[PDB]
Each structure stands twice: as structure tokens, then as C-alpha cells.
Amino acid sequence: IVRPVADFSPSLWGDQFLSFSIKNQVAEKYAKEIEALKEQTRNMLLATGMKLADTLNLIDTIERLGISYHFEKEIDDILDQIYNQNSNCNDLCTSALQFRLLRQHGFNISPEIFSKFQDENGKFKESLASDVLGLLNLYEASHVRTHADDILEDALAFSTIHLESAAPHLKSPLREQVTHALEQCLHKGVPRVETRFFISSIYDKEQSKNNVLLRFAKLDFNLLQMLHKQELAQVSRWWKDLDFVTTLPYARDRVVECYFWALGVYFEPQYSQARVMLVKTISMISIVDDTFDAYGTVKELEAYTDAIQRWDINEIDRLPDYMKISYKAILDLYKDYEKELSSAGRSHIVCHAIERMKEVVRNYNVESTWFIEGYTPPVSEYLSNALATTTYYYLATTSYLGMKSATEQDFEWLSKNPKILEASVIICRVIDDTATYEVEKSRGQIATGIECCMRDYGISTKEAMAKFQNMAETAWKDINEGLLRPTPVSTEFLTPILNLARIVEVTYIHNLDGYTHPEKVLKPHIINLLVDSIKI
Numbered sequence: 261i262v263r264p265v266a267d268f269s270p271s272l273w274g275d276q277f278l279s280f281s282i283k284n285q286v287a288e289k290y291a292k293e294i295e296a297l298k299e300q301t302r303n304m305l306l307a308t309g310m311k312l313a314d315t316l317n318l319i320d321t322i323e324r325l326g327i328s329y330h331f332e333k334e335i336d337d338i339l340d341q342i343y344n345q346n347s348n349c350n351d352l353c354t355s356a357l358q359f360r361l362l363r364q365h366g367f368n369i370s371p372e373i374f375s376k377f378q379d380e381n382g383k384f385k386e387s388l389a390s391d392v393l394g395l396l397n398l399y400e401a402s403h404v405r406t407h408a409d410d411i412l413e414d415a416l417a418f419s420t421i422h423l424e425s426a427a428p429h430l431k432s433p434l435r436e437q438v439t440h441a442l443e444q445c446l447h448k449g450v451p452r453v454e455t456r457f458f459i460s461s462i463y464d465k466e467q468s469k470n471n472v473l474l475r476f477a478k479l480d481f482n483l484l485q486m487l488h489k490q491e492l493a494q495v496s497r498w499w500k501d502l503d504f505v506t507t508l509p510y511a512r513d514r515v516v517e518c519y520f521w522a523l524g525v526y527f528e529p530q531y532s533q534a535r536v537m538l539v540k541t542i543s544m545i546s547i548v549d550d551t552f553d554a555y556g557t558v559k560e561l562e563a564y565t566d567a568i569q570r571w572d573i574n575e576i577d578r579l580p581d582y583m584k585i586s587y588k589a590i591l592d593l594y595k596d597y598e599k600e601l602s603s604a605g606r607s608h609i610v611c612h613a614i615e616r617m618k619e620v621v622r623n624y625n626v627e628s629t630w631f632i633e634g635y636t637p638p639v640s641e642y643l644s645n646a647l648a649t650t651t652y653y654y655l656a657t658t659s660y661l662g663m664k665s666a667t668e669q670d671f672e673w674l675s676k677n678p679k680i681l682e683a684s685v686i687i688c689r690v691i692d693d694t695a696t697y698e699v700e701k702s703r704g705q706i707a708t709g710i711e712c713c714m715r716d717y718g719i720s721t722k723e724a725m726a727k728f729q730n731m732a733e734t735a736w737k738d739i740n741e742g743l744l745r746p747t748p749v750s751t752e753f754l755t756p757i758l759n760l761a762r763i764v765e766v767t768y769i770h771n772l773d774g775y776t777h778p779e780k781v782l783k784p785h786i787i788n789l790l791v792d793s794i795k796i
């Protein structure tokens with residue numbers, strides 16, 4: 261058997277993450293000061309007699325600074341009061357911010373708040389084009405709409421054209437904030453990534469910045485970063501002790517990038533165990549993906565797929581040696597998970613992720629069959645297989661394993677493929693298909709998403725790309741609607757699904773596969789989040 265020649269770029273990180281020794285004196289010093297700053301900030305939030313605009317701006321700043329996870333109760337209380345008081349009497353910047361913050365927190369505020377800013381036709385009043393702060397907040401708000409918000413249909417185009425026009429003449433850091441927002445809106449960004457940018461490039465440079473908030477944000481970011489580096493060290497050692505870099509050299513070596521993905525799903529300290537479990541799964545399924553895509557023969561992949569369905573160490577002998585390596589590692593990893601969850605009495609929940617993994621692998625094998633047979637399915641059939649091969653049903657399920665509050669009912673809800681999950685999966689599918697269409701076409705993949713779309717509807721590549729873009733827009737509206745109260749499960753179990761969608765947007769920004777080629781996009785994020793501390 262002649263295997264195809266390897267082509268993936270090596271890990272660009274070497275061993276620079278393998279050993280991190282926390283400075284406990286510095287960590288304890290940061291924690292002690294943060295306790296004081298946290299209380300000062302709580303008192304700011306609880307201050308009586310604040311105007312609506314000031315209250316919304318304070319909450320917005322605390323959220324962008326990445327320290328709002330300390331104040332979930334306080335912020336919820338305040339937004340709930342604002343939601344139920346229904347003050348519709350403010351300028352564009354306050355109205356748009358009010359709308360965004362409430363919707364992001366699940367409060368279903370009416371989009372009629374924008375009617376006063378529009379003419380008879382429902383188009384935004386062009387007289388608003390000289391209000392830059394209003395336009396910026398309208399821009400950010402436009403990204404949180406649902407299918408019930410067609411009154412905002414014009415908001416993105418309107419805010420964008422006039423922000424672009426205004427930008428070159430704006431003072432700093434407002435200019436940089438506007439320019440950044442046009443590249444990456446807040447709602448669809450990865451939270452730590454946007455937080456790092458906001459602290460260092462914007463708030464640190466604001467003449468009017470609150471010094472207590474800025475110091476709090478910097479110390480908290482850097483303290484959490486120490487935990488993340490410990491986790492990544494622990495994960496780097498685990499990966500090193502598996503040595504797939506040598507024994508499975510056909511596979512993408514990307515455990516740092518996998519860690520960045522897990523960090524995007526949740527960054528908070530209470531999700532430490534969850535992050536570490538999640539990154540191990542992402543790493544391991546990536547090995548399997550490359551095994552199906554770029555090494556295994558038809559016959560091997562069949563045996564591998566069946567072995568995964570039976571999930572039994574007895575089955576290793578049916579596999580070639582190189583497949584024995586990944587197969588044992590997979591079984592062992594899930595045994596690791598079981599032991600890791602044993603003292604909490606949550607071992608039994610591991611079966612949910614295992615069943616999702618089997619699903620991914622069945623559909624990997626279908627994809628391989630289609631490729632060999634030269635089959636181009638209709639779009640409906642394509643999606644019935646290719647949605648699971650995003651791994652996103654699987655990763656969302658995995659994200660719950662380490663979450664201490666996840667119950668059987670939460671897994672049961674997820675198992676039914678709820679709308680918000682389906683939407684996140686679709687976003688991953690269509691954005692990846694758009695970014696990778698050309699290269700996969702070159703590699704002979706006749707069953708690529710765009711190709712299936714072209715043949716099915718009888719339309720150009722351009723038109724198919726556009727249809728896929730529409731599917732993504734529909735899915736984002738479904739995600740936003742999925743966050744609205746009453747939620748079917750606690751919001752805590754929705755945010756990982758939202759964040760998986762965000763990771764798609766961030767990783768394939770500018771229509772490129774950032775996981776396979778991390779140099780352009782992921783490398784700067786990894787450096788900013790996991791290498792460089794924020795200077796104080």
C-alpha cells in the first residue's frame with residue numbers, strides 16, 4: 261500500500277508550552293488585590309440613582325473588560341429591572357446598547373425601540389449618519405437579531421457605510437475601536453480574544469478610563485492566563501507522552517490550536533477540568549479525521565469504523581498497527597474521563613460523548629465511500645451526513661462532561677439535536693465548505709458542499725457560495741433566538757454552543773482554514789492569549 265505524501269505544516273510552537281512554573285507569590289498578590297478591586301466594582305454596579313445610559317455603559321465596559329463573570333447576579337438583576345421598566349425615550353447609542361445587552365442576556369426586548377430612528381419606509385434616518393457612537397452601537401446590535409427583527413434589516417448596511425466613511429478622521433482610540441468592530445463584531449467574536457483587544461488597544465488608551473476597572477481587568481486577565489498556561493502545559497505533556505507526532509506523522513499536529521478552541525468555549529477558572537477534557541477530545545478526533553482524509557485505505561477505514569462502533573479493546577487485532585495506536589488511545593481517554601468524574605459520581609455521563617463519537621466516525625466513513633465512488637449527493641443527503649462530520653454535535657456534548665452542574669436532563673436535551681445546536685453545526689459546516697471548496701476540489705473531492713449545491717440547484721459557484729452564506733445568516737438568527745428566555749436548559753449550557761459558533765467565525769475569518777494553517781489568524785491569538793501578558 262502506497263500512502264499519500266504528507267503535506268501538513270508542523271506545529272509551529274515546539275516545546276515552548278511544555279513547562280510552565282507559576283510564580284505563586286505573584287499569583288497570590290494578584291488574587292489579593294483583585295478581591296479588593298472586585299468589591300469596589302460591585303459597589304459601582306450597585307450604586308443608586310444612576311442614569312440609564314451610565315448604567316448600560318458601565319455594564320458594557322465591565323463585559324468588554326472580561327471581568328463580568330464575577331458579577332453575573334448583579335448584572336442580571338440590573339438588566340432585568342431595565343427590561344421590565346421599558347424606558348423608550350433615549351438617543352440611538354443608548355437605545356442600541358440597551359437592545360444588544362438585553363438580547364444577549366436573553367431578555368426579549370422589542371425591536372420597536374428602533375422605530376423612532378426610522379422613516380415611514382422602515383429605513384434608518386440618514387440624519388443619524390453623523391452620530392458615530394450611535395452608529396457603532398447600532399452596528400454591534402445589528403448582529404443579535406432573530407427572525408422576528410426584520411425591522412433591523414437595514415441596520416448593518418446603514419451603520420457600516422457611515423462608520424467606514426467616518427473612521428479615518430476619528431480621534432484615538434475610538435478610530436481603532438470602530439476599525440476593529442468593522443473587521444470583527446463583538447457578538448460573534450471569541451470572548452477572550454475581544455477582551456484582550458479591548459483592554460490593551462482601547463480601554464488602556466481612553467482618556468476617560470476608570471482606573472479601578474482597568475487595573476482589575478489587567479490583573480484578572482493575567483491571573484487567568486497563568487491558569488491557562490498551566491492547563492496547556494499539562495495538556496502538552498499528555499500529547500507529548502502520546503507521541504503521535506512521530507508514530508502518526510500523517511496527522512495534523514495541533515494540540516495548541518485545539519487548546520485555543522477549548523479556551524474559546526469557556527475561559528473561566530471553574531471550567532478548568534472541562535477545558536482540559538475538551539481539548540483532549542478535539543485533539544483525538546482530529547487524528548481520526550486525518551486518518552480518514554489523508555492516509556487510511558478503504559478496507560482499513562471500514563475496519564476502523566466497525567471497531568469504533570463495537571468499542572472494545574478486543575477489536576484492536578482487526579486493525580493495522582498504526583490504527584491500533586489511535587484506537588487504544590481513544591478507549592483509554594474515555595476510561596480516563598470515567599475515573600476523572602468518578603468521585604463526583606458523574607462517570608455514567610461519558611456514554612453520551614462516546615455515542616456522538618461513533619456518529620462522527622460512521623459519517624466520516626460515509627464521506628470516504630462517497631469520495632471513492634465519485635458520488636455527488638443532493639444537498640439534503642449531503643447535509644444529513646456532513647453536519648455531524650463538523651464534529652460539533654460531538655464537541656458540544658463533550659463540553660458538558662467537565663461541567664459540574666450538567667445533569668442527565670441537560671444531556672437528554674442535547675441528544676435531541678435542539679435548534680440552537682443544529683444552528684451552530686450548520687454555521688461550522690457552511691463556513692468551512694466555503695473556505696475549503698477550492699482546495700478540496702483540487703484533491704478530487706466531488707462531494708464537497710459547494711459542489712453538491714451547484715449540481716443540485718444548477719447554479720454557479722458564486723450563487724452556491726451565496727446560498728451557503730444565507731444558511732449561515734439564518735443559523736445565527738436561530739442561535740440568537742435560542743438564547744431568549746425562557747431557555748430550555750440553563751444559559752450555562754447554551755453559551756458553549758454559542759461559543760462554538762464564534763470559534764468558526766474567528767477561525768475562518770477572511771475565508772481561510774485557520775486550524776490547518778494557523779500562521780495567519782490563530783498564531784496571533786495564541787500569542788496574545790497564552791504567551792504575552794498584558795503590560796501593567
Ligand SMILES: O=S(=O)(O)C[C@@H](O)CN1CCOCC1
Nearest residue numbers: 542546549649650651692775
Ligand atoms: O472539515 S470540517 O468537519 O468541516 C472541520 C473539522 O475538520 C474541524 N476539526 C478541527 C479540530 O476540531 C475537530 C474538527
Ligand SMILES: [Mg+2]
Nearest residue numbers: 549550552553
Ligand atoms: Mg476531513
Ligand SMILES: [Mg+2]
Nearest residue numbers: 692693696700
Ligand atoms: Mg472540510
